[PDB]
Amino acid sequence: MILSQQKYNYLAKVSDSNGVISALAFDQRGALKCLMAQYQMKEPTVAQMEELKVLVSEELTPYASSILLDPEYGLPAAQARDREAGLLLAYEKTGYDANTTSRLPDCLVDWSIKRLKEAGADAVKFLLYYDVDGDPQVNVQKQAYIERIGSECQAEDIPFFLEILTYDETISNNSSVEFAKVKVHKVNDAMKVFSAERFGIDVLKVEVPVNMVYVEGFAEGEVVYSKEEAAQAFREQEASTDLPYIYLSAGVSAELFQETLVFAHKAGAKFNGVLCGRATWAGSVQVYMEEGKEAARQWLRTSGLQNINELNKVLKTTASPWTEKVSVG
Amino acid sequence: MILSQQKYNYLAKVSDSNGVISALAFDQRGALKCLMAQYQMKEPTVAQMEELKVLVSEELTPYASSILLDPEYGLPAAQARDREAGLLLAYEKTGYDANTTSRLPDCLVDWSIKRLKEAGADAVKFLLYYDVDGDPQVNVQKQAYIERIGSECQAEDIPFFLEILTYDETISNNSSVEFAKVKVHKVNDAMKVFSAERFGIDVLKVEVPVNMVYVEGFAEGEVVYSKEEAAQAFREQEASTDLPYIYLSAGVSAELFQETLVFAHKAGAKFNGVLCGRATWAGSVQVYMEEGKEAARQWLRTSGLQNINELNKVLKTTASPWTEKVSVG
Ligand SMILES: [K+]
Ligand SMILES: [K+]
Ligand SMILES: [K+]
Ligand SMILES: [K+]
Numbered sequence: 001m002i003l004s005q006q007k008y009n010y011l012a013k014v015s016d017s018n019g020v021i022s023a024l025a026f027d028q029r030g031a032l033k034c035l036m037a038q039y040q041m042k043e044p045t046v047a048q049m050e051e052l053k054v055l056v057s058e059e060l061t062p063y064a065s066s067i068l069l070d071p072e073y074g075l076p077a078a079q080a081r082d083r084e085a086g087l088l089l090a091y092e093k094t095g096y097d098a099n100t101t102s103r104l105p106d107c108l109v110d111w112s113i114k115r116l117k118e119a120g121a122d123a124v125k126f127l128l129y130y131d132v133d134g135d136p137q138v139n140v141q142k143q144a145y146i147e148r149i150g151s152e153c154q155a156e157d158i159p160f161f162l163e164i165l166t167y168d169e170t171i172s173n174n175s176s177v178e179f180a181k182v183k184v185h186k187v188n189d190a191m192k193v194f195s196a197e198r199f200g201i202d203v204l205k206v207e208v209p210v211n212m213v214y215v216e217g218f219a220e221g222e223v224v225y226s227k228e229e230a231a232q233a234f235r236e237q238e239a240s241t242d243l244p245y246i247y248l249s250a251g252v253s254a255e256l257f258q259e260t261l262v263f264a265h266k267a268g269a270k271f272n273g274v275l276c277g278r279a280t281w282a283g284s285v286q287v288y289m290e291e292g293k294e295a296a297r298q299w300l301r302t303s304g305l306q307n308i309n310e311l312n313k314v315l316k317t318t319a320s321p322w323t324e325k326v327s328v329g
Numbered sequence: 330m331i332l333s334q335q336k337y338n339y340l341a342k343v344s345d346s347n348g349v350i351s352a353l354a355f356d357q358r359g360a361l362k363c364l365m366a367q368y369q370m371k372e373p374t375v376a377q378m379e380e381l382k383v384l385v386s387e388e389l390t391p392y393a394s395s396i397l398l399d400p401e402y403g404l405p406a407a408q409a410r411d412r413e414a415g416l417l418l419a420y421e422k423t424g425y426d427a428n429t430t431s432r433l434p435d436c437l438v439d440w441s442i443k444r445l446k447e448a449g450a451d452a453v454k455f456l457l458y459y460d461v462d463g464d465p466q467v468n469v470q471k472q473a474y475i476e477r478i479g480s481e482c483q484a485e486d487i488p489f490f491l492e493i494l495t496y497d498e499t500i501s502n503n504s505s506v507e508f509a510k511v512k513v514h515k516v517n518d519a520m521k522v523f524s525a526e527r528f529g530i531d532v533l534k535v536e537v538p539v540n541m542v543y544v545e546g547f548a549e550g551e552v553v554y555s556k557e558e559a560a561q562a563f564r565e566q567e568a569s570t571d572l573p574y575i576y577l578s579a580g581v582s583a584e585l586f587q588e589t590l591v592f593a594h595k596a597g598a599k600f601n602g603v604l605c606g607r608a609t610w611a612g613s614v615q616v617y618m619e620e621g622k623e624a625a626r627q628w629l630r631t632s633g634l635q636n637i638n639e640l641n642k643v644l645k646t647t648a649s650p651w652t653e654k655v656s657v658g
Contacts, residue, residue, distance in 0.1 A: 030366055030370060030371055030372055031370060034363040034366055034367070037359055037363055038363070039427040040425055040426065040427035041359060041360060041423050041424030041425065042359055042423055042424030042425070043359055093371075094370050094371055095369045095370030095371030096369055096370065096371070097369065098368040098369035098618040098619050099618065099619065099620070099621050172615070172619055286501070289428065290427050290428065290501055291428070292428050
């Protein structure tokens with residue numbers, strides 16, 4: 001696995017001194033709007049959305065290797081980040097049509113990789129929804145789309161992070177037991193597909209392959225995987241790609257995310273860090289809305305800081321440096 | 330308690346043949362937008378919001394005495410209602426500033442009572458947030474505002490429904506045990522305040538005075554009220570006003586709402602019906618978004634119909650006619 005010198009340097013900028021991606025995610029758009037609105041039964045303003053991102057960026061990027069932000073609301077937050085923190089910018093439009101099964105990808109209309117680099121990104125993230133068992137023609141379209149982005153990133157010589165969120169065309173709720181029973185296949189086989197050279201991907205941002213709340217020991221109810229089956233799922237994930245890959249939190253609790261990382265490492269996964277969002281900053285939303293900006297700053301300086309510092313200490317003992325998977329050429 | 334002939338006739342139009350208000354609530358605006366958005370991680374369109382209201386109105390108003398709708402998205406739904414169903418229209422802007430404690434009221438800027446009557450309302454609903462223990466000057470402002478609306482409704486000779494949602498300036502979460510411990514006081518004393526002639530109110534739309542999930546027998550955890558204390562709370566509510574009053578569902582389950590009505594009646598409350606929303610139609614949102622319009626129609630014709638028919642059968646044995654509290658003069 002061979003990176004250009006420039007892509008290597010950009011990847012170093014979004015990583016810590018140990019060659020692990022210990023990154024903070026806050027590119028949420030519509031999702032954040034709804035999280036805020038619940039506290040007042042009316043929509044937040046643009047100013048409120050931009051300001052909360054600034055606060056999270058200011059207060060927590062001294063403790064992260066980089067931050068992921070959206071162009072729509074996150075550009076002030078990007079400017080406010082710690083000098084040693086790198087920047088990722090999201091390139092996809094959010095979401096999908098709930099009434100079709102295809103969940104096709106679409107880039108933000110005002111952007112190109114070139115423009116995202118010009119705006120200060122060290123790396124570009126694109127989220128793709130993918131069902132490996134879905135309509136083959138849909139998946140041809142998806143593969144073609146990713147090839148285009150991979151080619152843009154090759155030309156602009158900037159790292160391409162592909163985020164894969166799995167789904168099943170036939171299952172509505174990804175939190176269900178029914179989905180838990182197919183998730184390992186969905187996650188690991190999608191990674192296999194997108195490991196092909198033709199997609200130009202530098203880092204995969206992926207789900208852990210199991211739903212941990214259904215793993216023996218973690219399960220309060222039905223158990224879908226034994227501890228050993230879950231461990232096998234992590235080994236199979238590691239075997240599904242030679243690219244660097246990192247985990248998203250999926251908004252699980254800080255404690256569960258920490259436990260998942262420990263479990264992953266014990267099983268044999270050599271994951272290369274995380275792009276961790278809600279698990280770190282979730283509690284700031286209510287404080288910001290109800291108590292205001294300085295109160296939210298104080299939450300970030302206490303509870304947020306505790307969350308991210310605990311994450312960093314887990315990462316030191318669980319994550320593997322990406323420099324061991326990749327070299328310059 | 331004395332109503333004008335015209336107000337009496339309008340109230341009859343929004344009631345069933347037994348003189349009970351068996352009304353369907355669907356004036357939700359921002360709240361509905363977020364309920365829909367969760368199914369696709371992007372906002373619904375205006376067309377989608379208007380269409381779901383039409384479907385709910387078309388399919389369920391044959392089984393309700395009236396429907397409550399908002400002017401913003403609900404006017405097509407109002408036109409689509411069953412010929413025997415009356416119409417209520419909401420007059421307030423939704424929500425409040427989460428960062429202040431005053432939650433002051435504000436009418437929709439394009440509307441007046443006259444215009445709402447012209448648009449086809451048989452009655453007008455206004456939602457006020459009220460903390461009886463809050464800042465006395467805030468509560469003067471609130472009382473003055475309600476007096477204005479009461480006066481408009483007197484002039485236009487149309488029934489005024491005041492919805493009171495209680496809160497505590499010092500408690501953020503109304504679902505908490507801490508709020509459950511003050512709710513009876515908040516609800517019943519607010520009703521006492523707004524029973525004064527000067528407010529011109531014809532019907533109060535109010536919360537049940539307890540949080541039932543903390544009542545002995547219903548409680549899965551901590552118990553805040555014994556069954557007898559809860560029964561006393563309902564008697565105290567009935568004693569807090571001579572106006573007709575009806576219960577909102579607050580989005581509890583259909584089963585819990587049914588049980589609450591039975592409990593209320595057994596305790597001695599002579600509540601005069603309900604304006605019931607989410608408890609009836611909640612499940613239609615996911616079906617509409619994921620499976621489409623005709624699928625949502627089929628949900629309404631099956632599960633929705635079962636919900637509302639079960640509500641009507643409970644109402645027949647639990648609700649008291651308002652005609653026993655009020656006569657023409
Ligand atoms: K860095
Ligand atoms: K490998
Ligand atoms: K009627
Ligand atoms: K009374």
